[PDB]
């Protein structure tokens, strides 16, 4: 017998669990022998209102040829838009795009600026800096709000974000690193905002600390009790600073997985050698369909021989799950991992990824 690391279980309210299969199934398959969520952004995204568009919204770029996208957040029309260049030339938005993009007789060219959406690449001749996007008028037919996306395509200034893990569970502390880089300039950042957004739109704000002039660390406790149903969480951050007369604005995102520890593995023992059968004790908090997956491994070459999977419906309480391999001596074999999946969450809720020699079972 081998005792596995303890993991207190946590119950969750599941809406789709009743629809899951109640079939007790065992599968086996042959097999043979992402690490980081680091993400860089060369632009930013923001939500703006029609009231802000009327007054004018700052579009800040650091290099020529930035790409700008304006989409309504309601199923309504976009206003006729104007853009003020950094040299205070007021233009119809279309006149800030190339002659090619303004031409309706190219055919292959998309009608990139319409009443439904507006997308453009700023002509390199207009340079870079502070552009002002403004509405020509306001009516009760335009959308209330818009998503502005700015890709500063040819800027060497980027925002780098990452979390200390790809996967978390209920009660874990998440740590994020947020850094603003340019290999020529050293920035001093003070205006930073960051949060965690869940699949149902639930928000967990990050508590930030300044590590360096351009580096921030953020922490939060992940304590959502909701089922993510296979969907992921995102770290969202927004940074703004100034370097001389230039606005440095970057926003970034990175994904991470989250689960509720709805069930845990406790003890694993070898039941038989012919056929190679193992039994694992499981503590279940929420009635759902669970799958226990394991891999049999074999100077010396270590390689997987077969994967086994036991999937069944489990009510709250203690259970014994059985899994078998086809098959070599006990000394030349070991269990590569012990993973437990909750199909109600479509997440691994328990995993032991350390080798377990059969001589320990
Ligand atoms: Ca701000």
Tell me the CA–centroid distance for residue 191 and ligand 1, in Å.
Answer: 6
Of 326, 335, 338, 336, the residue nearest 281 (C-alpha): 338
Of 67, 46, 72, the residue nearest 135 (C-alpha): 72
Tell me the CA–centroid distance for residue 48 and ligand 1, in Å.
Answer: 13
The CA distances from residue 16 to 3, 22, 29, 201, 289, in Å, are 32, 13, 28, 19, 11
Tell me the CA–centroid distance for residue 106 and ligand 1, in Å.
Answer: 41
Distance of CA 26 to the CA centre of its chain: 32
Give the right CATH number for 34-42+156-261 from 2.60.40.1930, 3.30.420.40, 1.10.3190.10, 3.40.50.2300: 2.60.40.1930
CA-to-CA distance for 186 and 158, rounded, in angstroms? 12
Tell me the CA–centroid distance for residue 182 and ligand 1, in Å.
Answer: 21
Give the right CATH number for 43-155 from 1.10.540.10, 2.60.120.1370, 3.40.50.300, 2.60.120.10: 2.60.120.1370
Name residues with Cβ closer than 5 Å to ligand 1, which is an ion: 191
Tell me the CA–centroid distance for residue 39 and ligand 1, in Å.
Answer: 21
CA-to-CA distance for 282 and 188, rounded, in angstroms? 51
Tell me the CA–centroid distance for residue 59 and ligand 1, in Å.
Answer: 14
Phi, psi angles (nearest 5°) of residue 50: -60, -35
CA-to-CA distance for 253 and 194, rounded, in angstroms? 10
191 known ligand binder = yes
Token representation of residue 222 = 């992940």
Domain coordinates of the chain in residue numbers? Answer: 1-33+262-360, 34-42+156-261, 43-155
Half-sphere CA count of 58, side-chain side, radius 13 A: 10
Of 207, 351, 227, the residue nearest 288 (C-alpha): 227
Q: At the topology level of CATH, where does 1-33+262-360 sit?
A: Immunoglobulin-like (2.60.40)
228 known ligand binder = no
Element (H, E) at 102: helix 99-102
User: Quick check: 194 and 235 in contact, CB under 8 A?
Assistant: yes
Tell me the CA–centroid distance for residue 110 and ligand 1, in Å.
Answer: 35
Of 291, 269, 296, 310, the residue nearest 349 (C-alpha): 291
Token representation of residue 101 = 């993009």
Q: What 3-state DSSP class applies to 117?
A: coil
Task: Starting at the earlier edge strand, list the strands of the sheet with 263-273.
Answer: 2-3, 263-273, 276-284, 317-325
CA-to-CA distance for 287 and 315, rounded, in angstroms? 4
Contacts of 34 (CB under 8 A, 6+ apart): 166
Tell me the CA–centroid distance for residue 256 and ligand 1, in Å.
Answer: 25
CA-to-CA distance for 287 and 345, rounded, in angstroms? 12
Give the 3-state DSSP-derived string for 36-86, with helices as H, strands as E and coil as C. Answer: CCCEEECEEEEEEEHHHHHHCEEEECCCCCCEEEEEECCCCECCCEEEECC
The CA distances from residue 270 to 103, 274, 309, 330, 358, in Å, are 74, 11, 16, 10, 7
Tell me the CA–centroid distance for residue 236 and ligand 1, in Å.
Answer: 14
Distance of CA 150 to the CA centre of its chain: 20
Tell me the CA–centroid distance for residue 309 and ligand 1, in Å.
Answer: 50
**Strands 167-169 vs 246-259: parallel, antiparallel or unpaired:** parallel
Tell me the CA–centroid distance for residue 239 and ligand 1, in Å.
Answer: 8
User: Quick check: 332 and 359 in contact, CB under 8 A?
Assistant: no
Angle at 150 between CA 148 and CA 153, to 5 degrees: 165
Same fold, 1-33+262-360 and 43-155: no
Q: What 3-state DSSP class applies to 332?
A: helix
Which method resolved this structure?
A: X-ray
CA-to-CA distance for 21 and 153, rounded, in angstroms? 49
Tell me the CA–centroid distance for residue 62 and ligand 1, in Å.
Answer: 19
188 known ligand binder = no
User: Quick check: 36 and 177 in contact, CB under 8 A?
Assistant: no
């Amino acid at each position: 017998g081998f005792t596995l690391p303890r993991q207190p279980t946590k119950a969750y309210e599941c809406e789709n669990c009743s629809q899951l299969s109640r079939e007790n199934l065992h599968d086996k398959w042959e097999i043979t022998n992402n690490i980081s969520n680091v993400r860089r952004s060369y632009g930013y995204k923001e939500r703006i209102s029609l009231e802000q568009l009327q007054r004018g919204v700052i579009i800040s770029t650091l290099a020529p040829g930035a790409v700008v996208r304006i989409t309504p957040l309601q199923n309504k029309s976009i206003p006729e838009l104007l853009i003020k260049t950094p040299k205070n030339q007021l233009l119809p938005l279309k006149e800030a795009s190339s002659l090619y993009n303004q031409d309706d007789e190219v055919g292959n060219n998309p009608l990139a600026i319409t009443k439904h959406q507006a997308m453009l690449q700023i002509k390199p001749e207009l340079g870079y800096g502070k552009f002002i996007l403004k509405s020509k008028d306001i009516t009760n037919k335009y959308a209330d709000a818009y998503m502005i996306s700015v890709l500063d395509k040819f800027s060497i200034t980027y925002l780098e974000v990452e979390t200390d893990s790809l996967h978390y569970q209920y009660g874990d502390k998440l740590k994020a690193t947020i850094s603003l880089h340019n290999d020529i300039t050293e920035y001093d950042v003070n205006d930073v905002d960051a949060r965690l957004v869940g699949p149902k739109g639930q928000v967990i704000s990050l508590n930030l600390t300044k590590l360096k002039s351009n580096v921030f660390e953020g922490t939060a406790t992940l304590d959502s009790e909701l089922n993510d149903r296979g969907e992921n969480w995102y770290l969202e951050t927004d940074v703004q600073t100034e370097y001389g007369q230039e606005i440095i604005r970057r926003s970034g995102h990175t994904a991470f997985s989250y689960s509720i520890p709805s069930a845990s593995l406790m003890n694993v023992k070898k039941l038989s050698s012919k056929p190679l059968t193992f039994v694992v004790t499981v503590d279940v908090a929420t009635a759902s369909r669970y799958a226990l997956q394991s891999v049999l491994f074999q100077k010396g070459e270590a390689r997987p021989i077969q994967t086994s999977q036991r999937a069944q419906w489990l009510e709250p309480g203690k259970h014994v799950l059985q899994f078998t391999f086809d098959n070599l001596s006990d000394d030349n074999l070991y269990l590569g991992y012990l993973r437990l999946i909750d199909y109600g969450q479509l997440k691994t809720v328990y995993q032991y990824n350390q080798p377990v020699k059969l001589s320990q079972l």
